[PDB]
Amino acid sequence: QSALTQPPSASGSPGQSVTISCTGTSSDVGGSDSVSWYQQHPGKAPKLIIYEVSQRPSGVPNRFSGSKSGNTASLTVSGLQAEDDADYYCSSYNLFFGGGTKVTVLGQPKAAPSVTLFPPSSEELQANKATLVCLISDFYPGAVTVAWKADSSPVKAGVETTTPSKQSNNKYAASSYLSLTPEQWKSHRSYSCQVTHEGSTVEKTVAPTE
Amino acid sequence: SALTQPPSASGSPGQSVTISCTGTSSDVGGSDSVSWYQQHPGKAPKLIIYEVSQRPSGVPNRFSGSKSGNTASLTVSGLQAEDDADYYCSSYGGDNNLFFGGGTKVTVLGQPKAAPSVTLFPPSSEELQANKATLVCLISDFYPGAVTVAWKADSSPVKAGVETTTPSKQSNNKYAASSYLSLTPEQWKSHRSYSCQVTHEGSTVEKTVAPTE
Numbered sequence: 019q020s021a022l023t024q025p026p027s028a029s030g031s032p033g034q035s036v037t038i039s040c041t042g043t044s045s046d047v048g049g050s051d052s053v054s055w056y057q058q059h060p061g062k063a064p065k066l067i068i069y070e071v072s073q074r075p076s077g078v079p080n081r082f083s084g085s086k087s088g089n090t091a092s093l094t095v096s097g098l099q100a101e102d103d104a105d106y107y108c109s110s111y112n113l114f115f116g117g118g119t120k121v122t123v124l125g126q127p128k129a130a131p132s133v134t135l136f137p138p139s140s141e142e143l144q145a146n147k148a149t150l151v152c153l154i155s156d157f158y159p160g161a162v163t164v165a166w167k168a169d170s171s172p173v174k175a176g177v178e179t180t181t182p183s184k185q186s187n188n189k190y191a192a193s194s195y196l197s198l199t200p201e202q203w204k205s206h207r208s209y210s211c212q213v214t215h216e217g218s219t220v221e222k223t224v225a226p227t228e
Numbered sequence: 229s230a231l232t233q234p235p236s237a238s239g240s241p242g243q244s245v246t247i248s249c250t251g252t253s254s255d256v257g258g259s260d261s262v263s264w265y266q267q268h269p270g271k272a273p274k275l276i277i278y279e280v281s282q283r284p285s286g287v288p289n290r291f292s293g294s295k296s297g298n299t300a301s302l303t304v305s306g307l308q309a310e311d312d313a314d315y316y317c318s319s320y321g322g323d324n325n326l327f328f329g330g331g332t333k334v335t336v337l338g339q340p341k342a343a344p345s346v347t348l349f350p351p352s353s354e355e356l357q358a359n360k361a362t363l364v365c366l367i368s369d370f371y372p373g374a375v376t377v378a379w380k381a382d383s384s385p386v387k388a389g390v391e392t393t394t395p396s397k398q399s400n401n402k403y404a405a406s407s408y409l410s411l412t413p414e415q416w417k418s419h420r421s422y423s424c425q426v427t428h429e430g431s432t433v434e435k436t437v438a439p440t441e
């Protein structure tokens with residue numbers, strides 16, 4: 019979990035606006051005008067687009083604006099263009115990072131994920147494995163976050179999630195798996211997979227059977 | 229205003245690699261606010277060095293930073309698979325005066341071939357009540373990151389409704405993928421079994437599941 023809190027994702031068609039938030043404490047965001055925003059194209063070096071909450075370096079157009087209210091800073095991108103499709107990170111100066119927001123300029127219609135939660139198979143149990151798998155298919159944009167629950171409360175370790183890939187129907191698919199031991203699986207009431215895409219969250223629950 | 233890094237560098241497990249960040253006398257040369265960041269593809273960046281040489285809490289002493297004139301260096305000793313990532317330098321001069329290097333892709337050489345774990349899941353109770361019978365074949369812990377998948381209905385090849393994700397690198401430094409077959413309840417219930425066959429480096433592994441009793 020990132021020292022600063024940014025929504026995972028955001029999207030618009032060309033010419034639309036997107037606003038993205040970055041929340042900290044009075045110790046960082048809420049005490050000093052030292053919030054920066056970075057634009058990073060997958061594979062490339064980051065570009066500084068805002069510093070000290072609101073300042074644009076030279077070459078950064080006025081489409082990009084930065085504001086701060088109490089313990090939360092926002093970056094607004096107006097008139098979205100192709101080239102604005104990237105990862106956006108905030109920071110606060112020691113130095114604290116947000117977890118990043120994937121900003122998509124819609125290349126096709128939005129599609130909500132199909133989510134299927136599989137309990138452990140017979141065969142893997144007899145190998146002392148209780149890996150759960152949350153299959154997430156047929157979504158756009160190709161940005162998703164997965165949380166896992168044990169009973170009525172969050173779980174931490176175990177969780178792996180694949181990088182979403184574009185399938186034959188031109189929508190994205192990914193897999194989140196929780197590598198449980200049979201003892202962990204058999205000793206809880208239920209486990210749950212929570213899939214967040216385009217600000218809506220889907221929950222699936224499974225429990226052990228006989 | 230950019231800093232200059234070599235685009236690529238490599239080393240063997242247990243060995244060192246040194247990577248440079250060349251600035252001017254007014255960025256790197258003009259102050260000791262040189263940072264280094266580690267970034268795994270798809271992930272947020274992590275600060276590993278600030279003020280030329282200082283490690284944040286939780287960064288091992290395998291990572292060391294120095295500076296000589298307008299060039300700053302990062303050394304990673306005891307190279308491990310987790311160290312395979314992009315490394316960026318920055319220099320900070322107070323205003324808009326934050327400058328970045330273009331990044332160095334650090335490869336850890338000689339990661340050993342690893343065969344996949346293959347786990348095949350029959351349809352969940354919940355999707356069957358929702359008139360769906362998708363199967364998933366989880367393929368994890370393999371290296372290198374190329375697999376081919378084939379499905380069978382009973383003994384017969386399946387040629388339609390198969391999708392396999394592009395293998396991605398997970399936190400154990402090995403590749404995972406999923407192959408899913410989107411059957412109807414009627415297709416699932418009318419066959420004796422479905423099988424997923426995973427081929428990796430010319431070796432083949434097959435799993436079979438059957439409608440439950």
Ligand SMILES: CC1=NC(NN/C=C/Cc2ccccc2[N+](=O)[O-])=NC(=O)C1
Nearest residue numbers: 054056058064107111265267273316320
């Ligand atoms: C001294 C100060 N240092 C910094 N460093 N910011 C570093 C940011 C680095 C970053 C951001 C987004 C994506 C990738 C990366 N990366 O370097 O890998 N920001 C400040 O305001 C002040």
